[PDB]
Design a protein around this nucleic acid. Structure first.
Ligand code: MG
Ligand code: MG
Ligand code: MG
Ligand code: MG
Length: 65
RNA sequence: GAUUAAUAGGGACAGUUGGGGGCAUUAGUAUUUAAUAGUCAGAGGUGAAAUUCUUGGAUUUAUUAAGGACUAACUAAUGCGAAA
């Protein structure tokens, strides 16, 4: 099966925490996730990675995706 | 032998008030730029895009540092200064 990497600790009553940084410009949007110490990057998705037209590099749609 | 003492003016004095001024000092974020790490393909900019920047790593996140300016929010028909 899958080889996850989250620390060795599950539990449908044990919450995991990830600090999501979100910068919203009128041109581009960023969505970042990182340790609660913010020194090790995990996930990084920006509107640009989501659409073709530079004007849409902001969009509500690009934010959804 | 020298008028009063001008809701005239000059001085003394008394607590007090002010973003008045001159030297010191002292911060605070932010903008840059640099280090230390962190990823990952796009950043940035416009109505649209375009020159611009970028896996000899950008934008990005955390810590920290250097530097020059600036004093936010409180800051309002409120204050001070002859005015600037
Ligand atoms: Mg003073
Ligand atoms: Mg610029
Ligand atoms: Mg400094
Ligand atoms: Mg005042």
């Amino acid at each position: 099966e899958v080889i996850s990497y989250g620390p060795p600790n599950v539990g449908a009553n044990e919450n995991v925490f990830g600090v999501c940084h979100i910068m919203a410009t009128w041109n581009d949007t960023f969505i970042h996730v990182t340790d609660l110490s913010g020194r090790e990057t995990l996930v990084r998705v920006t509107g640009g990675m989501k659409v073709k037209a530079d004007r849409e590099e902001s969009s509500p749609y690009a934010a959804m995706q």
